Amino acid sequence: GAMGPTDQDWIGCAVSIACDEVLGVFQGLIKQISAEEITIVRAFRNGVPLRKQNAEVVLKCTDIRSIDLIEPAKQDLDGHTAPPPVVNKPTPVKLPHFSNILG
């Protein structure tokens, strides 16, 4: 809990995993987690989709060098408190002024 997160609470959260040079990098949503290995689904690797989209990736933590949670599970229901768009989502270009039509 204090360090090295490992529990069923993270399952389904979005994370990115940096493995050593020979393993490269993959990103995916976690399906299962255990102290010996992390398992995710819909593997994306090297900024491109892997042919085995349905296949799960299972990699031992000792082979992974570092991990980062990109999107933790949603806790706040957020009853339309703010606009649909969210800052957390990647922003390639900012839209100057407001378009003639909204939505």
Side-chain angles (χ1 to χ4, degrees), residues 11-49:
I11 300 302
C13 79
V15 299
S16 178
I17 312 308
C19 302
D20 57 15
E21 295 183 341
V22 180
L23 291 175
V25 183
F26 69 89
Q27 298 179 14
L29 293 166
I30 298 175
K31 184 185 184 217
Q32 289 185 337
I33 301 177
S34 66
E36 297 183 341
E37 60 185 334
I38 303 301
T39 304
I40 55 150
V41 299
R42 302 293 185 159
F44 270 80
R45 187 177 69 201
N46 301 135
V48 174

PDB file of all heavy atoms in Angstrom, residues 11-49:
ATOM      1  N   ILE A  11      -7.612  -3.222 -10.520  1.00  0.00           N
ATOM      2  CA  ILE A  11      -8.016  -3.992 -11.747  1.00  0.00           C
ATOM      3  C   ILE A  11      -8.932  -3.136 -12.640  1.00  0.00           C
ATOM      4  O   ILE A  11      -9.857  -2.499 -12.173  1.00  0.00           O
ATOM      5  CB  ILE A  11      -8.757  -5.242 -11.232  1.00  0.00           C
ATOM      6  CG1 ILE A  11      -7.828  -6.094 -10.344  1.00  0.00           C
ATOM      7  CG2 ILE A  11      -9.231  -6.093 -12.416  1.00  0.00           C
ATOM      8  CD1 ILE A  11      -6.569  -6.507 -11.119  1.00  0.00           C
ATOM      9  N   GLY A  12      -8.666  -3.130 -13.922  1.00  0.00           N
ATOM     10  CA  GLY A  12      -9.463  -2.292 -14.865  1.00  0.00           C
ATOM     11  C   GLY A  12      -8.940  -0.845 -14.933  1.00  0.00           C
ATOM     12  O   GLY A  12      -9.479  -0.039 -15.671  1.00  0.00           O
ATOM     13  N   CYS A  13      -7.904  -0.498 -14.185  1.00  0.00           N
ATOM     14  CA  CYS A  13      -7.358   0.899 -14.276  1.00  0.00           C
ATOM     15  C   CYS A  13      -6.367   1.015 -15.451  1.00  0.00           C
ATOM     16  O   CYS A  13      -5.779   0.035 -15.867  1.00  0.00           O
ATOM     17  CB  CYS A  13      -6.710   1.207 -12.897  1.00  0.00           C
ATOM     18  SG  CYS A  13      -5.058   0.458 -12.700  1.00  0.00           S
ATOM     19  N   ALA A  14      -6.189   2.201 -15.976  1.00  0.00           N
ATOM     20  CA  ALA A  14      -5.300   2.378 -17.167  1.00  0.00           C
ATOM     21  C   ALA A  14      -3.868   2.674 -16.718  1.00  0.00           C
ATOM     22  O   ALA A  14      -3.626   3.643 -16.022  1.00  0.00           O
ATOM     23  CB  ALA A  14      -5.881   3.578 -17.915  1.00  0.00           C
ATOM     24  N   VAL A  15      -2.921   1.853 -17.110  1.00  0.00           N
ATOM     25  CA  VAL A  15      -1.505   2.074 -16.678  1.00  0.00           C
ATOM     26  C   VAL A  15      -0.541   1.880 -17.854  1.00  0.00           C
ATOM     27  O   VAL A  15      -0.859   1.220 -18.828  1.00  0.00           O
ATOM     28  CB  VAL A  15      -1.247   1.032 -15.582  1.00  0.00           C
ATOM     29  CG1 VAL A  15      -2.213   1.267 -14.419  1.00  0.00           C
ATOM     30  CG2 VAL A  15      -1.460  -0.382 -16.137  1.00  0.00           C
ATOM     31  N   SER A  16       0.634   2.453 -17.758  1.00  0.00           N
ATOM     32  CA  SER A  16       1.676   2.226 -18.801  1.00  0.00           C
ATOM     33  C   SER A  16       2.895   1.566 -18.165  1.00  0.00           C
ATOM     34  O   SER A  16       3.279   1.902 -17.060  1.00  0.00           O
ATOM     35  CB  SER A  16       2.027   3.618 -19.324  1.00  0.00           C
ATOM     36  OG  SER A  16       3.055   3.510 -20.300  1.00  0.00           O
ATOM     37  N   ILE A  17       3.505   0.631 -18.852  1.00  0.00           N
ATOM     38  CA  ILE A  17       4.609  -0.159 -18.228  1.00  0.00           C
ATOM     39  C   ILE A  17       5.882  -0.025 -19.061  1.00  0.00           C
ATOM     40  O   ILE A  17       5.898  -0.343 -20.237  1.00  0.00           O
ATOM     41  CB  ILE A  17       4.137  -1.629 -18.218  1.00  0.00           C
ATOM     42  CG1 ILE A  17       2.699  -1.769 -17.656  1.00  0.00           C
ATOM     43  CG2 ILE A  17       5.091  -2.453 -17.349  1.00  0.00           C
ATOM     44  CD1 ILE A  17       2.572  -1.082 -16.293  1.00  0.00           C
ATOM     45  N   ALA A  18       6.944   0.443 -18.456  1.00  0.00           N
ATOM     46  CA  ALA A  18       8.246   0.537 -19.177  1.00  0.00           C
ATOM     47  C   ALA A  18       9.125  -0.659 -18.806  1.00  0.00           C
ATOM     48  O   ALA A  18       9.598  -0.767 -17.689  1.00  0.00           O
ATOM     49  CB  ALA A  18       8.877   1.841 -18.688  1.00  0.00           C
ATOM     50  N   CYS A  19       9.335  -1.556 -19.734  1.00  0.00           N
ATOM     51  CA  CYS A  19      10.210  -2.737 -19.473  1.00  0.00           C
ATOM     52  C   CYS A  19      11.623  -2.453 -19.985  1.00  0.00           C
ATOM     53  O   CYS A  19      11.839  -1.504 -20.718  1.00  0.00           O
ATOM     54  CB  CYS A  19       9.586  -3.904 -20.248  1.00  0.00           C
ATOM     55  SG  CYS A  19       7.878  -4.181 -19.709  1.00  0.00           S
ATOM     56  N   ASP A  20      12.581  -3.262 -19.608  1.00  0.00           N
ATOM     57  CA  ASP A  20      13.997  -3.002 -20.022  1.00  0.00           C
ATOM     58  C   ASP A  20      14.109  -3.012 -21.555  1.00  0.00           C
ATOM     59  O   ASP A  20      13.155  -3.296 -22.254  1.00  0.00           O
ATOM     60  CB  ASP A  20      14.833  -4.127 -19.394  1.00  0.00           C
ATOM     61  CG  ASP A  20      14.316  -5.508 -19.835  1.00  0.00           C
ATOM     62  OD1 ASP A  20      13.550  -5.575 -20.787  1.00  0.00           O
ATOM     63  OD2 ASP A  20      14.700  -6.481 -19.210  1.00  0.00           O
ATOM     64  N   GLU A  21      15.269  -2.701 -22.073  1.00  0.00           N
ATOM     65  CA  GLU A  21      15.387  -2.364 -23.533  1.00  0.00           C
ATOM     66  C   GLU A  21      14.826  -3.480 -24.422  1.00  0.00           C
ATOM     67  O   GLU A  21      14.230  -3.214 -25.451  1.00  0.00           O
ATOM     68  CB  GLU A  21      16.887  -2.193 -23.788  1.00  0.00           C
ATOM     69  CG  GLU A  21      17.409  -0.985 -22.998  1.00  0.00           C
ATOM     70  CD  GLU A  21      18.900  -0.757 -23.293  1.00  0.00           C
ATOM     71  OE1 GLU A  21      19.552  -1.676 -23.766  1.00  0.00           O
ATOM     72  OE2 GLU A  21      19.365   0.342 -23.039  1.00  0.00           O
ATOM     73  N   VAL A  22      15.010  -4.721 -24.038  1.00  0.00           N
ATOM     74  CA  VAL A  22      14.593  -5.854 -24.929  1.00  0.00           C
ATOM     75  C   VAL A  22      13.065  -6.023 -24.904  1.00  0.00           C
ATOM     76  O   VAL A  22      12.478  -6.529 -25.842  1.00  0.00           O
ATOM     77  CB  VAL A  22      15.293  -7.096 -24.355  1.00  0.00           C
ATOM     78  CG1 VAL A  22      14.932  -8.330 -25.189  1.00  0.00           C
ATOM     79  CG2 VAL A  22      16.810  -6.891 -24.391  1.00  0.00           C
ATOM     80  N   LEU A  23      12.425  -5.604 -23.838  1.00  0.00           N
ATOM     81  CA  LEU A  23      10.942  -5.755 -23.733  1.00  0.00           C
ATOM     82  C   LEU A  23      10.209  -4.523 -24.292  1.00  0.00           C
ATOM     83  O   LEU A  23       9.029  -4.585 -24.586  1.00  0.00           O
ATOM     84  CB  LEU A  23      10.689  -5.900 -22.236  1.00  0.00           C
ATOM     85  CG  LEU A  23      11.241  -7.243 -21.749  1.00  0.00           C
ATOM     86  CD1 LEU A  23      11.106  -7.328 -20.228  1.00  0.00           C
ATOM     87  CD2 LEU A  23      10.448  -8.385 -22.392  1.00  0.00           C
ATOM     88  N   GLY A  24      10.894  -3.412 -24.439  1.00  0.00           N
ATOM     89  CA  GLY A  24      10.236  -2.177 -24.969  1.00  0.00           C
ATOM     90  C   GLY A  24       9.152  -1.696 -23.998  1.00  0.00           C
ATOM     91  O   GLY A  24       9.253  -1.884 -22.798  1.00  0.00           O
ATOM     92  N   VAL A  25       8.118  -1.073 -24.509  1.00  0.00           N
ATOM     93  CA  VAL A  25       7.066  -0.485 -23.618  1.00  0.00           C
ATOM     94  C   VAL A  25       5.676  -0.900 -24.101  1.00  0.00           C
ATOM     95  O   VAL A  25       5.418  -0.937 -25.293  1.00  0.00           O
ATOM     96  CB  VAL A  25       7.225   1.038 -23.734  1.00  0.00           C
ATOM     97  CG1 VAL A  25       6.235   1.732 -22.790  1.00  0.00           C
ATOM     98  CG2 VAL A  25       8.654   1.447 -23.362  1.00  0.00           C
ATOM     99  N   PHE A  26       4.783  -1.207 -23.190  1.00  0.00           N
ATOM    100  CA  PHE A  26       3.369  -1.471 -23.591  1.00  0.00           C
ATOM    101  C   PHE A  26       2.406  -0.697 -22.684  1.00  0.00           C
ATOM    102  O   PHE A  26       2.755  -0.296 -21.593  1.00  0.00           O
ATOM    103  CB  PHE A  26       3.150  -2.987 -23.455  1.00  0.00           C
ATOM    104  CG  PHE A  26       3.150  -3.501 -22.028  1.00  0.00           C
ATOM    105  CD1 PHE A  26       1.920  -3.529 -21.291  1.00  0.00           C
ATOM    106  CD2 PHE A  26       4.369  -3.937 -21.405  1.00  0.00           C
ATOM    107  CE1 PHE A  26       1.903  -3.998 -19.937  1.00  0.00           C
ATOM    108  CE2 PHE A  26       4.350  -4.405 -20.050  1.00  0.00           C
ATOM    109  CZ  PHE A  26       3.119  -4.438 -19.317  1.00  0.00           C
ATOM    110  N   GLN A  27       1.197  -0.493 -23.139  1.00  0.00           N
ATOM    111  CA  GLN A  27       0.169   0.188 -22.299  1.00  0.00           C
ATOM    112  C   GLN A  27      -1.167  -0.546 -22.436  1.00  0.00           C
ATOM    113  O   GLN A  27      -1.481  -1.073 -23.489  1.00  0.00           O
ATOM    114  CB  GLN A  27       0.075   1.608 -22.859  1.00  0.00           C
ATOM    115  CG  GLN A  27       1.427   2.308 -22.693  1.00  0.00           C
ATOM    116  CD  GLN A  27       1.365   3.723 -23.277  1.00  0.00           C
ATOM    117  OE1 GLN A  27       0.299   4.243 -23.548  1.00  0.00           O
ATOM    118  NE2 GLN A  27       2.478   4.372 -23.487  1.00  0.00           N
ATOM    119  N   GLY A  28      -1.947  -0.587 -21.384  1.00  0.00           N
ATOM    120  CA  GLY A  28      -3.216  -1.377 -21.420  1.00  0.00           C
ATOM    121  C   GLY A  28      -3.986  -1.191 -20.114  1.00  0.00           C
ATOM    122  O   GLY A  28      -3.477  -0.636 -19.155  1.00  0.00           O
ATOM    123  N   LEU A  29      -5.214  -1.649 -20.073  1.00  0.00           N
ATOM    124  CA  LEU A  29      -5.973  -1.659 -18.789  1.00  0.00           C
ATOM    125  C   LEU A  29      -5.734  -2.977 -18.050  1.00  0.00           C
ATOM    126  O   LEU A  29      -5.768  -4.046 -18.633  1.00  0.00           O
ATOM    127  CB  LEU A  29      -7.443  -1.525 -19.189  1.00  0.00           C
ATOM    128  CG  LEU A  29      -7.682  -0.146 -19.807  1.00  0.00           C
ATOM    129  CD1 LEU A  29      -9.042  -0.132 -20.510  1.00  0.00           C
ATOM    130  CD2 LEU A  29      -7.670   0.917 -18.701  1.00  0.00           C
ATOM    131  N   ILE A  30      -5.493  -2.898 -16.769  1.00  0.00           N
ATOM    132  CA  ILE A  30      -5.164  -4.122 -15.974  1.00  0.00           C
ATOM    133  C   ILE A  30      -6.381  -5.054 -15.893  1.00  0.00           C
ATOM    134  O   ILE A  30      -7.497  -4.615 -15.690  1.00  0.00           O
ATOM    135  CB  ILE A  30      -4.781  -3.597 -14.578  1.00  0.00           C
ATOM    136  CG1 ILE A  30      -3.549  -2.687 -14.701  1.00  0.00           C
ATOM    137  CG2 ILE A  30      -4.469  -4.764 -13.628  1.00  0.00           C
ATOM    138  CD1 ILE A  30      -3.234  -2.053 -13.343  1.00  0.00           C
ATOM    139  N   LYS A  31      -6.164  -6.336 -16.056  1.00  0.00           N
ATOM    140  CA  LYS A  31      -7.257  -7.327 -15.822  1.00  0.00           C
ATOM    141  C   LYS A  31      -7.017  -8.065 -14.500  1.00  0.00           C
ATOM    142  O   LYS A  31      -7.948  -8.412 -13.797  1.00  0.00           O
ATOM    143  CB  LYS A  31      -7.186  -8.301 -16.998  1.00  0.00           C
ATOM    144  CG  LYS A  31      -8.337  -9.305 -16.893  1.00  0.00           C
ATOM    145  CD  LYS A  31      -8.207 -10.354 -17.998  1.00  0.00           C
ATOM    146  CE  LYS A  31      -9.416 -11.292 -17.955  1.00  0.00           C
ATOM    147  NZ  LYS A  31      -8.872 -12.635 -18.298  1.00  0.00           N
ATOM    148  N   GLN A  32      -5.773  -8.306 -14.163  1.00  0.00           N
ATOM    149  CA  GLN A  32      -5.453  -9.035 -12.894  1.00  0.00           C
ATOM    150  C   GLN A  32      -4.072  -8.607 -12.392  1.00  0.00           C
ATOM    151  O   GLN A  32      -3.208  -8.249 -13.169  1.00  0.00           O
ATOM    152  CB  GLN A  32      -5.452 -10.528 -13.245  1.00  0.00           C
ATOM    153  CG  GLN A  32      -6.881 -11.014 -13.506  1.00  0.00           C
ATOM    154  CD  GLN A  32      -6.873 -12.527 -13.742  1.00  0.00           C
ATOM    155  OE1 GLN A  32      -5.865 -13.090 -14.122  1.00  0.00           O
ATOM    156  NE2 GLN A  32      -7.963 -13.213 -13.532  1.00  0.00           N
ATOM    157  N   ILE A  33      -3.862  -8.640 -11.098  1.00  0.00           N
ATOM    158  CA  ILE A  33      -2.543  -8.220 -10.534  1.00  0.00           C
ATOM    159  C   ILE A  33      -2.132  -9.167  -9.404  1.00  0.00           C
ATOM    160  O   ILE A  33      -2.937  -9.546  -8.572  1.00  0.00           O
ATOM    161  CB  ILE A  33      -2.741  -6.789 -10.005  1.00  0.00           C
ATOM    162  CG1 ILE A  33      -3.189  -5.874 -11.154  1.00  0.00           C
ATOM    163  CG2 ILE A  33      -1.420  -6.266  -9.412  1.00  0.00           C
ATOM    164  CD1 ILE A  33      -3.471  -4.465 -10.625  1.00  0.00           C
ATOM    165  N   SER A  34      -0.881  -9.547  -9.377  1.00  0.00           N
ATOM    166  CA  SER A  34      -0.358 -10.371  -8.248  1.00  0.00           C
ATOM    167  C   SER A  34       1.102 -10.003  -7.980  1.00  0.00           C
ATOM    168  O   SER A  34       1.781  -9.480  -8.842  1.00  0.00           O
ATOM    169  CB  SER A  34      -0.471 -11.821  -8.716  1.00  0.00           C
ATOM    170  OG  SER A  34       0.411 -12.029  -9.811  1.00  0.00           O
ATOM    171  N   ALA A  35       1.589 -10.282  -6.799  1.00  0.00           N
ATOM    172  CA  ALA A  35       2.945  -9.778  -6.394  1.00  0.00           C
ATOM    173  C   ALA A  35       4.025 -10.212  -7.396  1.00  0.00           C
ATOM    174  O   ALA A  35       5.061  -9.582  -7.502  1.00  0.00           O
ATOM    175  CB  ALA A  35       3.215 -10.403  -5.022  1.00  0.00           C
ATOM    176  N   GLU A  36       3.792 -11.277  -8.128  1.00  0.00           N
ATOM    177  CA  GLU A  36       4.858 -11.824  -9.025  1.00  0.00           C
ATOM    178  C   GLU A  36       4.747 -11.237 -10.438  1.00  0.00           C
ATOM    179  O   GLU A  36       5.728 -11.164 -11.156  1.00  0.00           O
ATOM    180  CB  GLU A  36       4.620 -13.333  -9.048  1.00  0.00           C
ATOM    181  CG  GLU A  36       4.815 -13.906  -7.638  1.00  0.00           C
ATOM    182  CD  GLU A  36       4.649 -15.433  -7.652  1.00  0.00           C
ATOM    183  OE1 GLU A  36       4.062 -15.951  -8.591  1.00  0.00           O
ATOM    184  OE2 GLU A  36       5.113 -16.062  -6.714  1.00  0.00           O
ATOM    185  N   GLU A  37       3.570 -10.819 -10.843  1.00  0.00           N
ATOM    186  CA  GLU A  37       3.369 -10.398 -12.267  1.00  0.00           C
ATOM    187  C   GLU A  37       2.179  -9.438 -12.397  1.00  0.00           C
ATOM    188  O   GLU A  37       1.287  -9.423 -11.572  1.00  0.00           O
ATOM    189  CB  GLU A  37       3.114 -11.698 -13.039  1.00  0.00           C
ATOM    190  CG  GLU A  37       1.872 -12.407 -12.481  1.00  0.00           C
ATOM    191  CD  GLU A  37       1.687 -13.767 -13.168  1.00  0.00           C
ATOM    192  OE1 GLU A  37       2.148 -13.919 -14.289  1.00  0.00           O
ATOM    193  OE2 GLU A  37       1.084 -14.635 -12.558  1.00  0.00           O
ATOM    194  N   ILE A  38       2.171  -8.637 -13.433  1.00  0.00           N
ATOM    195  CA  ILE A  38       0.972  -7.796 -13.740  1.00  0.00           C
ATOM    196  C   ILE A  38       0.347  -8.259 -15.064  1.00  0.00           C
ATOM    197  O   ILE A  38       1.054  -8.574 -16.003  1.00  0.00           O
ATOM    198  CB  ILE A  38       1.502  -6.361 -13.873  1.00  0.00           C
ATOM    199  CG1 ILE A  38       2.234  -5.934 -12.584  1.00  0.00           C
ATOM    200  CG2 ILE A  38       0.335  -5.406 -14.139  1.00  0.00           C
ATOM    201  CD1 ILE A  38       1.291  -6.016 -11.377  1.00  0.00           C
ATOM    202  N   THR A  39      -0.964  -8.303 -15.143  1.00  0.00           N
ATOM    203  CA  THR A  39      -1.627  -8.812 -16.383  1.00  0.00           C
ATOM    204  C   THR A  39      -2.632  -7.783 -16.918  1.00  0.00           C
ATOM    205  O   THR A  39      -3.456  -7.273 -16.181  1.00  0.00           O
ATOM    206  CB  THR A  39      -2.351 -10.088 -15.948  1.00  0.00           C
ATOM    207  OG1 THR A  39      -1.417 -10.981 -15.358  1.00  0.00           O
ATOM    208  CG2 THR A  39      -2.999 -10.753 -17.163  1.00  0.00           C
ATOM    209  N   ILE A  40      -2.571  -7.483 -18.194  1.00  0.00           N
ATOM    210  CA  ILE A  40      -3.502  -6.466 -18.791  1.00  0.00           C
ATOM    211  C   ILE A  40      -4.106  -7.003 -20.095  1.00  0.00           C
ATOM    212  O   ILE A  40      -3.729  -8.052 -20.577  1.00  0.00           O
ATOM    213  CB  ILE A  40      -2.660  -5.215 -19.085  1.00  0.00           C
ATOM    214  CG1 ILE A  40      -1.468  -5.592 -19.974  1.00  0.00           C
ATOM    215  CG2 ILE A  40      -2.153  -4.599 -17.778  1.00  0.00           C
ATOM    216  CD1 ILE A  40      -1.085  -4.403 -20.853  1.00  0.00           C
ATOM    217  N   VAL A  41      -5.037  -6.278 -20.666  1.00  0.00           N
ATOM    218  CA  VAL A  41      -5.714  -6.748 -21.919  1.00  0.00           C
ATOM    219  C   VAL A  41      -5.638  -5.671 -23.010  1.00  0.00           C
ATOM    220  O   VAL A  41      -5.360  -4.521 -22.737  1.00  0.00           O
ATOM    221  CB  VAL A  41      -7.169  -7.022 -21.522  1.00  0.00           C
ATOM    222  CG1 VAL A  41      -7.202  -8.117 -20.456  1.00  0.00           C
ATOM    223  CG2 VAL A  41      -7.809  -5.747 -20.957  1.00  0.00           C
ATOM    224  N   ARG A  42      -5.878  -6.046 -24.252  1.00  0.00           N
ATOM    225  CA  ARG A  42      -5.772  -5.070 -25.394  1.00  0.00           C
ATOM    226  C   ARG A  42      -4.374  -4.444 -25.428  1.00  0.00           C
ATOM    227  O   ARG A  42      -4.201  -3.264 -25.192  1.00  0.00           O
ATOM    228  CB  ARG A  42      -6.846  -3.998 -25.152  1.00  0.00           C
ATOM    229  CG  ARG A  42      -8.225  -4.661 -25.076  1.00  0.00           C
ATOM    230  CD  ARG A  42      -8.593  -5.233 -26.447  1.00  0.00           C
ATOM    231  NE  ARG A  42      -9.993  -5.745 -26.296  1.00  0.00           N
ATOM    232  CZ  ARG A  42     -10.785  -5.924 -27.339  1.00  0.00           C
ATOM    233  NH1 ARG A  42     -10.390  -5.671 -28.567  1.00  0.00           N
ATOM    234  NH2 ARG A  42     -11.997  -6.370 -27.145  1.00  0.00           N
ATOM    235  N   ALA A  43      -3.381  -5.243 -25.722  1.00  0.00           N
ATOM    236  CA  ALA A  43      -1.964  -4.767 -25.633  1.00  0.00           C
ATOM    237  C   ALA A  43      -1.650  -3.726 -26.714  1.00  0.00           C
ATOM    238  O   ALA A  43      -1.837  -3.959 -27.896  1.00  0.00           O
ATOM    239  CB  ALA A  43      -1.111  -6.017 -25.852  1.00  0.00           C
ATOM    240  N   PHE A  44      -1.171  -2.577 -26.311  1.00  0.00           N
ATOM    241  CA  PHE A  44      -0.549  -1.631 -27.285  1.00  0.00           C
ATOM    242  C   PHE A  44       0.945  -1.504 -26.982  1.00  0.00           C
ATOM    243  O   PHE A  44       1.331  -1.307 -25.848  1.00  0.00           O
ATOM    244  CB  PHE A  44      -1.261  -0.291 -27.076  1.00  0.00           C
ATOM    245  CG  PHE A  44      -2.490  -0.104 -27.941  1.00  0.00           C
ATOM    246  CD1 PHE A  44      -3.746  -0.702 -27.575  1.00  0.00           C
ATOM    247  CD2 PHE A  44      -2.398   0.684 -29.138  1.00  0.00           C
ATOM    248  CE1 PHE A  44      -4.901  -0.511 -28.404  1.00  0.00           C
ATOM    249  CE2 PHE A  44      -3.554   0.875 -29.966  1.00  0.00           C
ATOM    250  CZ  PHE A  44      -4.805   0.276 -29.599  1.00  0.00           C
ATOM    251  N   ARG A  45       1.783  -1.615 -27.983  1.00  0.00           N
ATOM    252  CA  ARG A  45       3.259  -1.599 -27.738  1.00  0.00           C
ATOM    253  C   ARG A  45       3.954  -0.689 -28.750  1.00  0.00           C
ATOM    254  O   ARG A  45       3.560  -0.608 -29.896  1.00  0.00           O
ATOM    255  CB  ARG A  45       3.706  -3.049 -27.924  1.00  0.00           C
ATOM    256  CG  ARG A  45       5.178  -3.183 -27.534  1.00  0.00           C
ATOM    257  CD  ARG A  45       5.603  -4.650 -27.644  1.00  0.00           C
ATOM    258  NE  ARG A  45       5.582  -4.957 -29.110  1.00  0.00           N
ATOM    259  CZ  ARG A  45       5.483  -6.195 -29.562  1.00  0.00           C
ATOM    260  NH1 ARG A  45       5.407  -7.229 -28.751  1.00  0.00           N
ATOM    261  NH2 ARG A  45       5.465  -6.399 -30.850  1.00  0.00           N
ATOM    262  N   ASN A  46       4.987   0.005 -28.331  1.00  0.00           N
ATOM    263  CA  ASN A  46       5.748   0.905 -29.268  1.00  0.00           C
ATOM    264  C   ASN A  46       4.802   1.879 -29.992  1.00  0.00           C
ATOM    265  O   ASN A  46       4.954   2.144 -31.169  1.00  0.00           O
ATOM    266  CB  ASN A  46       6.430  -0.028 -30.278  1.00  0.00           C
ATOM    267  CG  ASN A  46       7.350  -1.006 -29.541  1.00  0.00           C
ATOM    268  OD1 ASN A  46       7.351  -2.187 -29.825  1.00  0.00           O
ATOM    269  ND2 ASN A  46       8.141  -0.562 -28.601  1.00  0.00           N
ATOM    270  N   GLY A  47       3.831   2.405 -29.287  1.00  0.00           N
ATOM    271  CA  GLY A  47       2.928   3.439 -29.883  1.00  0.00           C
ATOM    272  C   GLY A  47       2.155   2.871 -31.082  1.00  0.00           C
ATOM    273  O   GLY A  47       1.694   3.614 -31.929  1.00  0.00           O
ATOM    274  N   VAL A  48       2.009   1.568 -31.161  1.00  0.00           N
ATOM    275  CA  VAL A  48       1.156   0.967 -32.234  1.00  0.00           C
ATOM    276  C   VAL A  48       0.408  -0.266 -31.680  1.00  0.00           C
ATOM    277  O   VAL A  48       0.891  -0.910 -30.772  1.00  0.00           O
ATOM    278  CB  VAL A  48       2.142   0.587 -33.350  1.00  0.00           C
ATOM    279  CG1 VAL A  48       1.428  -0.191 -34.463  1.00  0.00           C
ATOM    280  CG2 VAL A  48       2.728   1.867 -33.941  1.00  0.00           C
ATOM    281  N   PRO A  49      -0.752  -0.567 -32.240  1.00  0.00           N
ATOM    282  CA  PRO A  49      -1.573  -1.683 -31.705  1.00  0.00           C
ATOM    283  C   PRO A  49      -0.924  -3.030 -32.043  1.00  0.00           C
ATOM    284  O   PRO A  49      -0.457  -3.238 -33.149  1.00  0.00           O
ATOM    285  CB  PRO A  49      -2.927  -1.537 -32.416  1.00  0.00           C
ATOM    286  CG  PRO A  49      -2.860  -0.253 -33.186  1.00  0.00           C
ATOM    287  CD  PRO A  49      -1.406   0.070 -33.392  1.00  0.00           C
TER     288      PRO A  49
END
